[PDB]
Design brief:
The structure is cut from a larger assembly and holds chains A, B, C, D and E. Chain B is 27% helix and 33% strand. Chain B is an alpha+beta fold. Chain E is α/β, with parallel strands linked by helices. Classes of the chains: A mainly alpha, B alpha+beta, C alpha+beta, D alpha+beta, E alpha/beta. The interface between A and C is small, with 9 and 11 residues. The complex binds zinc ion. Chain D: Keywords: Cell cycle, DNA replication, Nucleus. Chain D: It comes from Saccharomyces cerevisiae (strain ATCC 204508 / S288c) (Baker's yeast).
């Protein structure tokens, strides 16, 4: 019935779909305030009451839908700037086991905004693309150290992103399950 | 030494380049590029739904420009040649050349829906209708800046022999009325720094020898100006000449100082655009040249706050490396109460004379009154905790709602001040009698 | 003295920055090679030329001298992307320059990069060359070490710690080696 | 919701299960196409190129004429079934 | 009916309004394949409409024969239709099966304007205009740059008066207007403007200008330079202004992997300079062959002699231009100033547009169009075979369309690899034609017929045939000062037993003033109307025809006997 590759996990398309439901801040280039939108899964007042160059908050999928045309501009999140990413890299280097406290959707949102909204950043984009890479590489080192503690009981993780978890899910759970089977078989 | 020059609202010099911005406002901006012996002009809008961006070629080398949501006005300061362009096609554009004395030049131009205005270095004022029919000529101080919003017009004038001054008028189609005529202006001058510092920003002062960075009407028609000291000034109570007064409402330097963690990031500059209620629209410019370039960077938004703080005291209170400095709650509450008071008064004056535009601004005024009493209650509670009954009682007079006075009674009980509970209840009874009357 | 550091800095910044569209192709290749314990990098000439033609000019003029500098630059990047020990990495090249027929090679081509083709007709057995090597001083019994690299060396004679005219011998018990092979092209 | 390799019990089994699927797909819950696509909707409008000459055809949104190697700019929610059938490509 | 430059905007508005409904595909584009300007024009339009969310279909078309077929089958709800790159020369209301009474919705009582259920728009650079389309029609709507009201006074007058007139005075007036119209008609065929250029003006009007649209403007324009030099030269200054206007500030900054630039710098009339080698660039140049006679050894030795004097070692001149030494690359711009004069070859120097994106290296517009044309030519009883061939040629339209995208540079490189082989094969046929002296020098025109070849199939496509013709025309233009003549070129096919024939004009040298006109159109039409012969005329370019094996000689006999040449 359901496809074989969706029995236990989410595909990256579903991960993008999940991230798209979050709110985001925009500057509209038109006034809607005095037809009306009449949505059923969100607030409707914000879109009906827009005024040009007045900041407002909407779901990300509608924000990208507007930015496809001239009618909107997207404000970048404050963590997505050179100063903050510098500090997070320094945190990563300083604490060789803890993960730095980046938001749960950082990879997905960065790789959406760099494609759909390359024109709306303040920093030069060719530097952000480097610092995002540095963060992902350091985190991958820390992941490879952690896979030596798979065990029969449990594990704790902190600040690991959704896409990063979903990348690893079928390996961690499978090896952990077999260690559990081997151990309990000796008890019985 | 001073010398007269042309101006337009928030233009840029050419610098090293062959292009520049002529002017900016909330509606849009104008830019031009030089092509050997000719120029190309482009007009941009932020409301892309309501208007069309477009371009055309100028052979005459315009150096003056003025924009509104009806059209754009262009001028040449040496040749006296001018042109007005409606944003519609239906009313075709028209041109004229204005007489000038030897060495005389146009310093500024502006336009209402039906009036056209021109000023010169030799203090001559000339005016025409929307079809160039002349109306009147007048002789004044030399004009250095002009701005307009519907029928309300705001002017600035300067002379070696008469000082710095301003005028305010309303060109009503029913009748034309003056509210102020060349009355003295308290603005901060830049000349001392230009003469002493030799900062290599001299080109900006050549481009703008007055150093008046920009000026515009608020989103509710208040006259506003941004000084060479990088401070925002607003004229209050202009409807009442014995009460009219200039108010300093925001210092940009103080904001960057706090934002940088108390540091001197002089590499950062603020370029203002327009005032929307309580919030400044501006560009944050970084590097050598203190003004923006192409393609246009995105704007920013910033709130006004009253000047009350001190660097050394806040450093002492404060005492990750760039973290913005922490402030005493007393300063925060005090600043809020002052800001709430000023905002409420300005909004009240607007409503008293011009009413609501949208039907909800009274709710904002109610919120401001709530914030005002809330801030006063914190300051009052501090005075009570200090056991200063005299100061606490003086503060209690300034509270509005009996809800707040009841809270003040509870605060006095926590402070264990039955004398103040008594005197507050005397005040509450007196004000209840005044409410019953 | 400083030129050796500027050149290494330049090739180091090449690997860390070359994007074509959205993938840092040399950072990804260098990481993916280490995971399967392959210590090498396959650079392409056309990308080097596109990045900065001056670097390619230096490489084209003096290859015997400059290839070792680029190899040590690769090692310096390999540590950052994988450590919070590794040998020196091998540089490998691809090119589309005009082939020279084997019969036309002559005295004009000595110490130049050459691209050619033919048929392999013979292969030697493998043999051992030294890279890191340790030394004992016969008189004072002091000890030191040397680092060889295989581009066109002999044992030194500046004795240390008189100490004698030719006092150095090799400690094979604490030295490192690599494989080498010979081939014939027809 | 061809036959020669299936055993006859399996040949009737498949028919029975098809009846069951169309029974679920009908009645209540009909508004969601249970046999439709399982990939989340990414875009409203797409460009599709015409791969097979099926001529003129009808669909719930309207009529199409599939002139070989012509290209449409059209909403995906319409042409999803034709892409699955194989008359169209997304380019 | 027609609209001018002062109101192209309004037709665009009407189209938006007219084709509003999302329940149906209310907008259709018909585009001529085997035309580069048409292709770029169409691409521009599709982007425009994309932004506006107008559902639409694009159909490529080969010729008249297919035009009729495609028109026939159309749905009634199709409010708007576009003809891009064809049809301006012909009576469309006559050609199509039209009665206006079948398409009128509403008649505006006030204006007398008839609103039709289907509006037909025409974009075509060809002239003269068919009078019926301009003056006569109410459904047909043509876009004109001012050629109609500039030119057509006498003709407009004549048309209307002749129409209205339906004894001495009557006879005089009807003979007068018959004379006017007959003088206007039966002129030679000519191209006067760029399609994409006109589109760019509309984009300017609206406010849709950006580097992606300006580069398509340049590409479209540039395709004219080989055959219509005059046109190109007229247009060129505008392009410089635009390129200088839209290029950003802070110029000559350091590279980044994202940095895109468009800039004016030297370009050379050398065949694909920045690919292959410097030596091949000179050796296969269409101009150099006419200037130094490279079909024989006394020409080839001149080229060796030149490189020896220029101070470039001949074994380095043959290296791949990317890998050629940096010093020669930067000194080349001065070496040419000292040496081309001695070989009479100074015309090689000129200015052109170059584009680069990130780290992947430069390309000029002149090289780009050769890549696109190569992809059109070689990309991958009798009626069925003709149908299969004409269907294969349409797939190459999409093989070229998908190469206008920066995400697909892989396909563009393939196009360049094909371009080199095409020019090689062309050169290896040109030398055979000249050395065996197959050109027959008749008194009125020059005749050449290919009865056999190394592979004659390559000339079965019209564009390849025109490339060979443009080779021979440069050779004939420079070989003698005398006798600028028309030329006829033909090639046999063993499967059809038909000759594919093309009629070609002369032209004046690059460095040298009204334009000439191609008159083979009326001549081929008149012989076709007269003749017994089995022939075909269905191509958009009427200067190309087809005829069976046995009928070539009587057709050419009747042609040379005619006074129309
Ligand atoms: Zn020693």
């Amino acid at each position: 019935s359901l496809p074989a590759h969706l029995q236990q996990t989410f595909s990256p398309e579903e991960i993008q779909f999940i991230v798209e439901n979050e709110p985001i801040k925009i500057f509209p280039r038109i006034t809607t305030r005095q037809t009306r939108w009449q949505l059923i899964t969100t607030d409707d007042k914000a879109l009906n009451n827009m005024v040009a160059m007045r900041s407002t908050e909407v779901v990300l999928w509608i924000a990208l839908l507007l930015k496809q045309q001239s009618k909107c501009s997207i404000v970048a999140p404050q963590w997505l700037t050179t100063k903050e990413l510098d500090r997070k890299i320094q945190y990563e280097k300083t604490h060789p086991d803890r993960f730095s406290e980046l938001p749960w959707n950082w990879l997905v949102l960065a790789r959406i905004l760099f494609n759909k909204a390359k024109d709306d950043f303040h920093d030069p984009i060719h530097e952000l693309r480097g610092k995002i890479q540095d963060l992902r590489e350091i985190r991958q080192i820390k992941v490879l150290k952690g896979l030596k503690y798979l065990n029969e009981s449990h594990l704790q993780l902190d600040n690991l992103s959704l896409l990063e978890i979903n990348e690893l899910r079928p390996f961690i759970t499978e090896i952990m399950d077999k260690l559990r089977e081997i151990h309990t078989a000796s008890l019985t | 030494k001073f010398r007269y020059m042309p101006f337009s609202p928030a233009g840029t010099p050419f610098g090293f380049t062959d292009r520049r911005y002529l002017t900016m406002n909330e509606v849009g901006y104008v830019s031009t590029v030089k092509n050997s012996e000719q120029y190309s002009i482009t007009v941009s809008f932020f409301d892309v739904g309501r208007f069309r961006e477009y371009h055309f070629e100028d052979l005459f080398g315009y150096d003056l420009c003025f924009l509104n949501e009806k059209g754009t006005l262009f001028g040449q300061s040496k040749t006296g040649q001018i042109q007005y362009r409606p944003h519609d096609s239906i009313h075709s554009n028209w041109t004229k050349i204005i007489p000038l004395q030897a060495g005389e030049r146009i310093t500024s131009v502006a336009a209402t829906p039906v009036r056209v205005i021109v000023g010169t270095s030799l203090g001559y004022f000339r005016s025409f209708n929307q079809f160039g029919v002349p109306f009147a000529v007048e002789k004044t101080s030399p004009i250095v800046a002009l701005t307009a919003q519907n029928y309300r017009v705001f002017s600035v004038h300067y002379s070696q022999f008469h000082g710095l001054s301003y005028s305010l008028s309303e060109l009503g189609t029913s009748s034309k009325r003056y509210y102020k005529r060349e009355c003295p202006l308290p603005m901060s001058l830049p000349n001392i720094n230009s003469d002493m510092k030799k900062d290599a920003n001299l080109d900006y002062y050549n481009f703008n020898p007055m150093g008046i960075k920009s000026l515009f009407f608020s989103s509710y028609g208040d006259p506003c100006i941004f000084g060479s000291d990088n401070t925002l000034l607003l004229l209050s109570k202009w409807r009442s000449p014995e009460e009219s007064k200039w108010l300093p409402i925001l210092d940009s330097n103080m904001e960057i100082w706090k934002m940088s963690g108390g540091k001197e990031t002089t590499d950062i500059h603020v370029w203002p655009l327009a005032l929307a209620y309580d919030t400044l629209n501006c560009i944050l410019v970084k590097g050598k040249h203190i003004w923006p370039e192409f393609p246009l960077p995105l704007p920013s938004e910033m709130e006004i706050r009253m000047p009350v703080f001190v660097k050394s005291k806040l450093l002492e209170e404060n005492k990750e490396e760039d973290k913005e400095i922490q402030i005493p709650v007393s300063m925060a509450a005090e600043e809020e109460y002052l800001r709430s008071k000023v905002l409420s008064e300005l909004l009240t004056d607007t409503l008293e004379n011009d009413g609501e535009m949208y039907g909800n601004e009274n709710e904002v005024l109610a919120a401001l009154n709530g914030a005002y009493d809330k801030a006063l209650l914190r300051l009052f509670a501090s005075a009570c905790s200090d056991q200063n009954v005299e100061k606490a009682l003086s503060l209690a007079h300034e509270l509005k709602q009996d809800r707040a006075l009841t809270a003040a009674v509870k605060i006095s009980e926590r402070a264990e001040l039955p004398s103040l509970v008594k005197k507050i209840n005397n005040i509450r009874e007196a004000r209840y009698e005044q409410q019953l009357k | 003295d400083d030129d050796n550091t500027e050149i290494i800095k330049s090739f180091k910044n090449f690997i860390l920055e070359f994007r074509l569209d959205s993938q840092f192709i040399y950072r990804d290749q260098l990481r993916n090679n280490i995971l399967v314990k392959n210590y090498s990098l396959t650079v392409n000439m056309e990308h080097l030329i596109g990045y900065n033609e001056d670097i390619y000019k230096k490489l084209s003029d003096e290859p015997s001298d400059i290839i070792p500098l680029f190899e040590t630059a690769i090692t310096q990047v390999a540590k950052r992307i994988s450590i919070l020990s590794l040998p020196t990495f091998q540089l490998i090249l691809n090119s589309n320059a005009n082939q020279i027929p084997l019969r036309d090679l002559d005295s004009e081509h000595v110490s130049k990069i050459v691209r050619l083709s033919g048929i392999i007709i013979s292969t030697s057995v493998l043999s051992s060359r030294a890279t890191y090597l340790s030394i004992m001083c016969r008189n004072c019994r002091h000890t030191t070490s040397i680092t060889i690299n295989n581009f066109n060396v002999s044992l030194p004679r500046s004795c240390l710690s008189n100490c004698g005219p030719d006092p150095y011998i090799i400690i094979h018990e604490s030295s490192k080696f690599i494989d080498q092979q010979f081939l014939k092209l027809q | 919701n061809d036959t020669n390799n299936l055993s006859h019990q399996e040949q009737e089994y498949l028919k029975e299960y098809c009846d069951l699927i169309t029974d679920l797909k009908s009645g209540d819950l009909v508004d969601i196409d249970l046999s439709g696509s399982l990939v989340p909707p990414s875009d409203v409008f797409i460009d599709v190129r015409v791969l097979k000459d099926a001529g003129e055809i009808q669909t719930e949104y309207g009529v199409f004429n599939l002139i070989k190697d012509s290209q449409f700019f059209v909403r995906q929610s319409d042409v999803e079934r034709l892409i699955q059938q194989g008359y169209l490509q997304k380019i | 009916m027609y609209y001018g430059i002062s109101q192209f905007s309004e037709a665009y508005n009407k189209i938006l309004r007219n084709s509003s409904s999302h329940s149906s595909c209310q907008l259709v584009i018909f585009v001529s394949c085997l035309n580069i300007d048409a292709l770029c024009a169409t691409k521009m339009l599709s982007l425009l409409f994309k932004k506006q969310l107008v559902q639409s279909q694009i159909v490529p078309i080969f010729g008249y024969s297919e035009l009729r077929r495609h028109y026939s089958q159309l749905d009634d709800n199709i409010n708007s239709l576009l003809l891009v790159g064809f049809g301006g020369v012909i009576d469309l209301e006559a050609f199509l099966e039209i009665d206006p009474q079948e398409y009128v919705i509403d008649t505006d009582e006030k204006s007398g304007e008839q609103s039709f259920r289907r509006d037909i728009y025409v974009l075509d650079a060809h002239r003269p205009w068919n009078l019926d389309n301009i003056f006569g029609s109410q459904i047909i709507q043509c876009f004109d740059d001012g050629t109609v009201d500039d030119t057509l006074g006498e003709q407009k007058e004549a048309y209307y008066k002749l129409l209205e007139l339906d004894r001495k005075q009557r006879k005089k007036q009807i003979h007068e207007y018959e004379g006017v119209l007959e003088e206007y008609y039966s002129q030679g065929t000519t191209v006067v403007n760029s399609i994409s250029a006109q589109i760019y003006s509309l984009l300017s009007a609206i406010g849709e200008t950006n580097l992606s649209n300006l580069w398509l403007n340049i590409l479209g324009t540039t395709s004219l330079d080989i055959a219509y030099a005059q046109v190109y030269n007229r247009l060129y200054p505008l392009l410089q202004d635009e390129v200088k206007r839209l290029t950003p500030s802070s110029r000559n900054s350091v590279k980044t992997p994202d940095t895109l630039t468009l800039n004016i710098q030297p370009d050379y009339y050398l065949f694909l300079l920045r690919h292959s080698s410097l030596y091949d660039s000179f050796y296969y140049s269409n101009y150099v062959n006419a200037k130094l006679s490279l079909w024989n050894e006394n020409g080839k030795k001149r080229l060796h002699k030149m490189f020896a004097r220029m101070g470039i070692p001949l074994s380095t001149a043959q290296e791949t231009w990317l890998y050629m030494d940096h010093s020669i690359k930067r000194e080349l711009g001065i070496i040419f100033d000292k040496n081309l004069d001695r070989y009479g070859l100074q015309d090689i120097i000129r200015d052109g547009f170059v584009r680069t994106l990130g780290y992947r290296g430069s390309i000029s517009a002149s090289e780009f169009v050769e890549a696109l044309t190569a992809l059109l030519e070689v990309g991958n009883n009798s009626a069925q075979k003709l149908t299969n061939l004409r269907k294969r040629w349409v797939s190459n339209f999409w093989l070229s369309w998908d190469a206008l995208d920066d995400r697909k540079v892989e396909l563009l490189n393939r196009g360049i690899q094909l371009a080199q082989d095409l020019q090689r094969a062309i050169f290896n046929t040109g030398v055979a034609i000249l050395e065996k002296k197959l050109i027959k020098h008749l008194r009125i025109y020059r005749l050449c017929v290919l009865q056999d070849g190394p592979d004659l199939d390559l000339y079965r496509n019209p564009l390849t045939l025109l490339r060979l013709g443009n080779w021979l025309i440069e050779c004939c233009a420079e070989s003698e000062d005398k006798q600028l003549l028309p030329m006829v070129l033909a090639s046999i096919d063993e499967n059809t037993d038909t000759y594919l024939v093309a009629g070609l004009t002369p032209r004046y040298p690059r460095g040298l003033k009204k334009p000439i006109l191609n008159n083979f159109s009326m001549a081929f039409q008149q012989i076709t109307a007269e003749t017994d012969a089995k022939v075909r005329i269905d191509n958009f370019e009427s200067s190309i025809i087809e005829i069976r094996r046995e009928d070539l000689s009587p057709f050419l006999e009747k042609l040379t006997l005619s006074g129309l040449l």
